[PDB]
């Protein structure tokens, strides 16, 4: 490897000396240094394993992956956090999966519906309480299109059968009532929640309009895996519709049960988040013969590449439309590079997020002249690590399911100019004097997808990297 790769291998060694010998050996398999001649990670890294006990993993649980990520954004359904009160309260409106509607009336994403388990429910089971809750839900929220039941930890442990309740209640209400066994003890992270949720959509939603007439066009597509953080999916959909495509569905940012049921009628599935929804895309290819492709709408290089590749799946009219859309936004893109690249170029970034963004945003940083010196994921699988390798410079530190100790030690040693990570990481690194942008919530900004999102992303990296307060952490008498 190069001199960076060597410094990073020595750093891995030095950081892991703190761990008890067993954990140390185990953790050494979760980090590596990139090689531009490598097409696949092979044995260089492992991932999607259990977290080490007690190390302060960043990871969440399967309910976060199912309720928090995949189903919670669907605006026309009511999602029940079924179990004790915590899970639903902590995840109430924490994720900025934007949608339009009238809250509590035709759209329900900011309400927290829960069965608020008490000891009586643990002792006698919660299925009767769940059935009565669903009756009260229908009386008070009549315009729901469907209801989901998001299991928390106790539900499967006490032996409840929410699928029996969902079947009975669906008949009673004559609306889809969908049971999800996404108890947080399952799996190792948010990731199994995604997979669980995709299997539930496969069985309980996707076949609901099978055999029915549906008026198609030759250019029908679905956005698969964009949760519209700060309106990211709207900033993506606009480009696809400007290119002459009809976006029949968006999964699941600003999404609806209806759109999901109409997804089997499209011509092409466009997968943005591969980790969370590749499962259902593969299922639609095998059952419905709908092709799918991965794309990336972060920054001008990736956007143009994506628009051209998506348009190449259709015909010359859509191919010409892709060139027209790219030409239409080229002046905006040139102005953004001219104003912000000189303020950011040369600066070094460390990224740590969940399962997509740690690789996906690299192009946009590179468009602004920045360099990624380390990238990690909370819960990605080795096929995500494989997909990260083409966008890393040789010797970059690449790592998986880091503890807070390990992130802090990497930051202290590597001295990135800017960090992109989450809310639990933000206030630690700011106190260490490192500019920090939340790359899950967009630090209450965004969108970052699309052409309109690239302007905001550039504005935001400059605002934070170059803020005058970073020159004031040391008192002037020290």
């Amino acid at each position: 490897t190069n001199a960076t790769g060597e410094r990073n291998l020595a750093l891995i060694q030095e950081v892991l000396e703190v761990f008890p010998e067993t954990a140390r050996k185990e953790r050494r398999k979760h980090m590596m240094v990139s090689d531009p001649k490598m097409k696949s990670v092979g044995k260089c890294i492992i991932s999607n394993r259990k977290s080490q006990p007690g190390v302060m993993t960043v990871r969440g649980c399967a309910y976060a992956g199912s309720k928090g990520v995949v189903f919670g954004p669907i605006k026309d359904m009511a999602h029940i956090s079924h179990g004790p009160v915590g899970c639903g309260q902590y995840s109430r409106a924490g994720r900025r999966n934007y949608y339009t509607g009238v809250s509590g009336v035709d759209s329900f994403g900011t309400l927290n519906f829960t069965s608020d388990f008490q000891e009586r429910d643990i002792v006698f089971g919660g299925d009767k309480k769940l059935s009565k809750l669903i009756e009260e839900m229908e009386l008070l929220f009549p315009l729901t299109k469907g209801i989901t039941i998001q299991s928390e930890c106790p539900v499967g442990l006490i032996g409840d059968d929410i699928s029996a309740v969902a079947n009975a209640s669906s008949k009673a209400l004559d609306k889809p009532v969908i049971p999800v066994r996404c108890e947080g003890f399952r799996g190792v992270s948010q990731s199994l929640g995604h997979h669980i949720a995709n299997d539930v959509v496969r069985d309980w939603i996707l076949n609901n309009r099978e055999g029915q007439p549906f008026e198609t066009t030759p250019y029908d597509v679905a956005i698969i895996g964009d949760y519209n953080i700060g309106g990211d999916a709207w900033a993506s959909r606009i480009l696809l519709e400007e290119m002459g495509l009809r976006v029949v569905a968006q999964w699941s940012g600003d999404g609806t049960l209806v759109e999901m049921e109409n997804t089997p009628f499209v011509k092409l599935n466009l997968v943005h988040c591969y980790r969370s929804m590749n499962y259902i895309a593969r299922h639609m290819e095998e059952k419905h013969q709908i092709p799918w492709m991965e794309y990336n709408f972060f920054g001008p290089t990736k956007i143009a590449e994506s628009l051209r590749k998506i348009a190449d799946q259709f015909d010359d009219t859509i191919r010409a439309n892709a060139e027209a859309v790219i030409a239409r936004y080229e002046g905006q893109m040139a102005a953004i590079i001219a104003k912000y690249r000189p303020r950011l170029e040369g600066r070094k970034v460390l990224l740590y997020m969940g399962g997509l963004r740690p690789r996906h945003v690299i192009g946009a940083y590179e468009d602004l002249g920045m360099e990624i010196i380390a990238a990690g994921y909370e819960f990605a699988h080795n096929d995500d690590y494989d997909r990260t390798l083409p966008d890393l410079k040789e010797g970059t530190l690449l790592f998986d399911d880091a503890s807070s100790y390990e992130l802090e030690a990497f930051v202290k040693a590597l001295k990135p100019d800017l960090i992109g990570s989450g809310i639990k990481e933000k206030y630690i690194f700011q106190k260490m004097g490192v500019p920090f942008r939340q790359m899950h919530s967009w630090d209450y900004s965004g969108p970052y997808h699309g052409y309109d999102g690239f302007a905001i992303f550039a504005r935001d990296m400059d605002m934070t990297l170059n803020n005058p307060a970073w020159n004031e952490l040391t008192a002037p008498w020290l």
């Binding site: 302060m56 976060a64 509590g104 952490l473």
Partner: protein
Amino acid sequence: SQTIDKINSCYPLFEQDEYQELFRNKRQLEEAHDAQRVQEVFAWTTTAEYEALNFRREALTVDPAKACQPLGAVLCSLGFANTLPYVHGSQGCVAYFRTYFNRHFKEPIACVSDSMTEDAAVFGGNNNMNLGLQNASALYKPEIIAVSTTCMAEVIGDDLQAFIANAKKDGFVDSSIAVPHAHTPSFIGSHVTGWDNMFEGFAKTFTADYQGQPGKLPKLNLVTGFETYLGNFRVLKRMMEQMAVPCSLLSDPSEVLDTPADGHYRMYSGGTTQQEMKEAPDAIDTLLLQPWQLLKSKKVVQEMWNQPATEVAIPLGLAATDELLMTVSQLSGKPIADALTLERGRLVDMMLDSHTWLHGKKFGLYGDPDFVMGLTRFLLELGCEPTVILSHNANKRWQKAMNKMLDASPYGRDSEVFINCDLWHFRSLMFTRQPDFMIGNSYGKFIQRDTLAKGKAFEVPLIRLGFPLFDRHHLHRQTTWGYEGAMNIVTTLVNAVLEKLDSDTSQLGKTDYSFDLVR
């Protein structure tokens, strides 16, 4: 599209013509209910008819105003020196506790899990405890590892005491590390219950076999319970120093929740020391400042430490601060400091100066049981009417005491108290009872929005006092207890009145006959 000179974030980007058109086109693919039907249903949700149906609920909870036990244990644990909160169970819980406190305090929050998974569901979580204590000790070097539990651990019945003994005997965690524990089932009570349970575990660990003697130290201990205003820990210490009465707060997270941004990350800062907790039984007494939630802590004080546990009301407002200082004076034998009497008189001066805007104003309020009782009391003392009073996690004994206090007051005649009711209940009450203002936490913003959508005449503005406060910055630094905190409350209430009156009288040529310069 975007212009280079003025880039618009999400709002107001999506207000642009191209995005309004995009939304019209997407709406055609959603099978949206018709706009008149949605309007009809929204109007229906604001009625008394809907409210009666809403108040028939037995199983569904909507927009709860409480959180689960371990959250409270974590906060308790953060208040001790060199302590690492550790929650035995499933990891999702710990990501959420950290994030919830991160967004209120704007600060890092240290807390670990031992990541119990399906394997631990079958065999018990003993291996996770052993490895979790060893790895946590190695990476974070705590003096105290303060263990609580998630609901998975509770359902499966892991024996915490036995696991922790087995870890030390087997060499997974050094014997010099203190490892207090508490069972904190999220299906019992709420986050305030967790805090009290965690405190009982610290008291057992540090004092079980101690031969204490009350008054051997001429000090008073103070126990705050679950409290998320930094200024309340600090004002108690400041008033005790003015009283010249030695004091320890037992659980004080106010330094670890406010470390400086000076180029260093400090996982640990300040907090109750082991010496303060170990010598707690030798104090004259321990004052439990949020009495409705400090139930097991009162049993510690009286049964384990043989101290009075002198009853004190939450020290919120003028009269309740007076009573706290008279109690401190009686127990210590020291006179109330002249600086405190001067501060008291300045609060009374503020009250007299602002009373014409507060008298007769109607408020809705919700929160934890101790806080709601305290703030209801002070509102009555101001001549305000707390007409709608809700505490989701309160019990019938608390509700009886509340109605007793209200019935005795000239200002409690139109007051209704609700327990085991949530914010979807509170939302209906804001529509039907229409107080002038509501006092709540950031979840109340949705109710304010809902009431405004009925019309400007129906809007009930939110005043943020409580937890969590996620949509304004640095309110967590404030004080709400003592004379200092009552000054904050008075100023916040009066200026909320005056801001709304200015907004209502700010329509040029229409309502600005009353847009007075001087108020």
